[model samples]
Target: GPFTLDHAPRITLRMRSHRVPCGQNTRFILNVQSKPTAEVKWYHNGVELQESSKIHYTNTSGVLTLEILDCHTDDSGTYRAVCTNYKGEASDYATLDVTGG
Candidate 1:
């Protein structure tokens, strides 16, 4: 079989993050073109997300999902997904907007 689509770990149909009100929950999803499926990590603005009740993240195949258990104004920032595999690494970023503080 011929190899095609993403060579390195990359987000093709990168989900353009999302927005929600202060008291709402939101899910941020990201997608990749193909696999070696890459390891996905999430960042808020430029800082890596630590263990927090505010967010939980999971990934499978080429899709990365971020579950926001609670919305806070501080959660409003650039959310980036950086995936790395044996081939190489690639990343995608979008903004999370929390309104009505």
Candidate 2:
């Protein structure tokens, strides 16, 4: 079958690394383009990250976002965004380095 608007989720933009101060908010964002859209999942280091009081996730108009309510030393690590849909999957990541005590 010929392709129309269906295709694997493609990551067009990746979030930039950050060096934030502890106790402040931090955010990581990326962009994905998919025919039928995609579901976004977040990961810290290598483990899946779940939404909590301090962690949040959102995807609007293809913009994937992950927010950390309060940056802390334990929050410093590689943050990855994974997108999946009926077509396929794609992913990108960024790093965080929280400073200050």
Candidate 3:
């Protein structure tokens, strides 16, 4: 028997500033292109963020945003943006380097 699976959604993240100054906030915008309205989630260093005061997410028209306030060294890591639907899931990861001010 042959099996078939639908293609997962595609996602990409773009930071407002690649090199953000310390003690400042960094804004990341995620652009998702797919069908069935993909669900978006953010992961820092492989740990899924449970939504905190420091982190906020907004999604509109397939675009997602992950905002981090008061950036620090601990905030530096491989941030992953994921999108999932009934078909499957897709994700993209980016490294965030917090340079001291």
Whole-model lDDT per candidate: 0.77, 0.89, 0.78
> Which candidate would rank higher by TM-score, 1 or 3?
3
Off by over 4 Å in 3: 1-7, 12-17
1-101 per-residue lDDT for model 3 (tens digits): 12243446866545443766789988778788766677777888998976788988788988888888999989988888888987789887777789979
lDDT per residue (tens digit) for residues 22-68 in model 1: 98888878777545667777788888986578778877767678877
TM-score of 1: 0.81
Question: TM-score of every model?
Answer: 0.81, 0.89, 0.81
Worst 10 residues of 2 by lDDT: 1-10
Off by over 4 Å in 2: 1-3
* Tens-digit lDDT track of model 2 for 1-101: 55687999998888999899998998988899998878888899999989899899888899888999888889999999889999899988889999995
Q: Could you tell me the TM-score of candidate 2?
A: 0.89
Candidate 1 local distance difference test against the native: 0.77
lDDT of 3: 0.78
